[PDB]
Every structure is written in structure tokens, then in C-alpha cells.
Scaffold this motif. Structure first.
Motif, mmCIF file in Angstrom:
data_model
loop_
_atom_site.group_PDB
_atom_site.id
_atom_site.type_symbol
_atom_site.label_atom_id
_atom_site.label_comp_id
_atom_site.label_asym_id
_atom_site.label_seq_id
_atom_site.Cartn_x
_atom_site.Cartn_y
_atom_site.Cartn_z
ATOM 1 N N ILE A 72 0.849 -1.184 0.000
ATOM 2 C CA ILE A 72 0.000 0.000 0.000
ATOM 3 C C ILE A 72 0.889 1.240 0.000
ATOM 4 O O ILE A 72 1.954 1.259 0.629
ATOM 5 N N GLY A 73 0.462 2.267 -0.726
ATOM 6 C CA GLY A 73 1.188 3.518 -0.717
ATOM 7 C C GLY A 73 0.593 4.486 -1.719
ATOM 8 O O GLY A 73 -0.487 4.253 -2.281
ATOM 9 N N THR A 74 1.326 5.577 -1.923
ATOM 10 C CA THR A 74 0.924 6.609 -2.866
ATOM 11 C C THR A 74 1.164 6.151 -4.295
ATOM 12 O O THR A 74 2.168 5.503 -4.601
ATOM 13 N N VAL A 75 0.221 6.477 -5.175
ATOM 14 C CA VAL A 75 0.361 6.189 -6.592
ATOM 15 C C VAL A 75 0.099 7.478 -7.354
ATOM 16 O O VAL A 75 -0.832 8.222 -7.020
ATOM 17 N N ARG A 87 10.458 3.304 -5.667
ATOM 18 C CA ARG A 87 11.014 2.833 -4.391
ATOM 19 C C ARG A 87 9.977 2.818 -3.278
ATOM 20 O O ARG A 87 10.069 1.992 -2.357
ATOM 21 N N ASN A 88 8.987 3.713 -3.335
ATOM 22 C CA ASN A 88 8.018 3.780 -2.246
ATOM 23 C C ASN A 88 7.244 2.477 -2.098
ATOM 24 O O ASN A 88 6.812 2.140 -0.987
ATOM 25 N N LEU A 89 7.076 1.711 -3.187
ATOM 26 C CA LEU A 89 6.455 0.395 -3.092
ATOM 27 C C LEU A 89 7.456 -0.761 -3.150
ATOM 28 O O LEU A 89 7.174 -1.825 -2.580
HETATM 29 CL CL CL Z 1 4.094 5.847 -0.296
#
Ligand code: CL
Ligand code: A1BHU
Ligand code: CL
Lengths: 99, 99
Positions: A72-75, A87-89
Motif C-alpha cells: 500500500i502507498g501513494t500512486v 522505491r516507495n512500493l
Molecule cells: Cl508511499
């Protein structure tokens, strides 16, 4: 898995009920997906790379399945030529670069 | 080493006798370096990224040390915002993506 880099590291992702192919991209800070519909509020953002900047829609708290791994994270959604897992995922699925 | 992705995967490179910082970038096919003078003849190339296309100069058989590992190959020189080590050189140093 161990992915060699003789070819582009493309994997299957599931996002917003759709299946897409995306690039595992250690050079991308954030994840950028081609124009689609996602639920929720979004805010506009400008992101830059080779060639200059594009405007994207920032969605938060999005669930995405990457090669069968839930994260889960920002897209960021916008006119990118390729779907990019950044990298965030990649951190959430425990990806590392080894040499 | 094993490199996690909570931070940008930046390394020191040595090219043309100068130390530079560069991003290990699995999403880049080729290696792209900021403006400098390199030896030999160059050829033209047009490369596309997230924000459009730029014109670069292609130099072949360039010696480059990447985090202490010697590689010899093609380098593109142009107006990139960061120095990028792409798959053409990542394969020479034996890098893989693992999760
Ligand atoms: Cl994120
Ligand atoms: C804040 O969040 C973000 C997230 C992503 C980006 S980013 O997308 O601007 N960028 C960032 C780096 C360029 C610094 C990530 C980087 O991995 C990017 C992804 C990519 C791949 C294909 C198409 C579009 C983007 N690669 C690429 O531009 O490569 C080019 C250049 C080298 C060779 C020549 C081309 C042939 O076709 C491509 C594959 C190329 O390979 C920026 C900010
Ligand atoms: Cl970790």
C-alpha cells in the motif's frame, strides 16, 4: 525471485481491479501509472525526469499487488509512457539490489 | 553489497578521472551522464523519458568504475538531471534485483 537485468524487469501488477504490466524501477522515487480511474480524493503534482516535467494526480493509501505481493502507498496517475513501480512500493515487498 | 531502497541507490563512479555520484537505475536501458568531455568520436541518439525526448551524444567503449567495479561500455552524455547507471552497465557488474 532473483531478476537479472539482461531485459527490462517487467512484472504483472493488479491495481484498481485491473491487471497491468509495470517496470521495477530503482531510479524512480515514486510509483507512476498511466491514466486510469481510481477512487478517492487526489491532489495535483508535477514530477520531473528526462525530458522535463509532467502533471500527475496523487492518490494516497492505494493497495497494489506486485508479482503477487500486496503493498500500500501513494500512486501517481498521469501520461507516463510506461507503468513504473518506484522505491516507495519496492521497499514494501522487500526488494534489494545486489552485486 | 546488498542495497535496500529506503534511500536513493546512489554510488560513486569514476569516469574520465573524475569522481561523480550516480543512481543505480533498473528502469533505465542505458547509462546517461551529465555534460562532460570524453575521448573519441560520438554518434547521435534520441532518448525518451517521462517528460519527452532529449538529444544525447553516444560514446562507446568508455572505462567507468562503479562503486569500485570496472565496466567498459556505452555512455550517453546529455542534459540529464542526475547521472544514471542503466542496465547496460548494471549487467556488467553482476547486479540483480531480489525479493
Ligand atoms: Cl508511499
Ligand atoms: C518522483 O517520482 C518519479 C518517478 C519516476 C521518474 S522517471 O520515470 O523520470 N525516472 C527518474 C530518473 C530519470 C531520475 C525513472 C527512470 O527509471 C525512467 C523510467 C521510465 C522508463 C521509460 C519511460 C519513461 C520513464 N527511465 C528512463 O527515463 O529511461 C530512459 C532513459 C535511458 C534509456 C533511454 C530510454 C529508452 O526508454 C527508457 C526506458 C530509457 O532508457 C521521476 C520521478
Ligand atoms: Cl528492509
Amino acid at each position: 525471485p532473483q531478476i537479472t537485468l539482461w531485459k527490462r524487469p517487467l512484472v504483472t501488477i493488479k491495481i484498481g481491479g485491473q491487471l497491468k504490466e509495470a517496470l521495477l524501477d530503482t531510479g524512480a522515487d515514486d510509483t507512476v501509472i498511466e491514466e486510469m480511474s481510481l477512487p478517492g480524493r487526489w491532489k495535483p503534482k508535477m514530477i520531473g525526469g528526462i525530458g522535463g516535467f509532467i502533471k500527475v494526480r496523487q492518490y494516497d493509501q492505494i493497495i497494489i499487488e506486485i508479482a503477487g505481493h500486496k503493498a500500500i502507498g501513494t500512486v501517481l496517475v498521469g501520461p507516463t509512457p510506461v507503468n513504473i513501480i518506484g522505491r516507495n512500493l519496492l521497499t514494501q515487498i522487500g526488494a534489494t539490489l545486489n552485486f
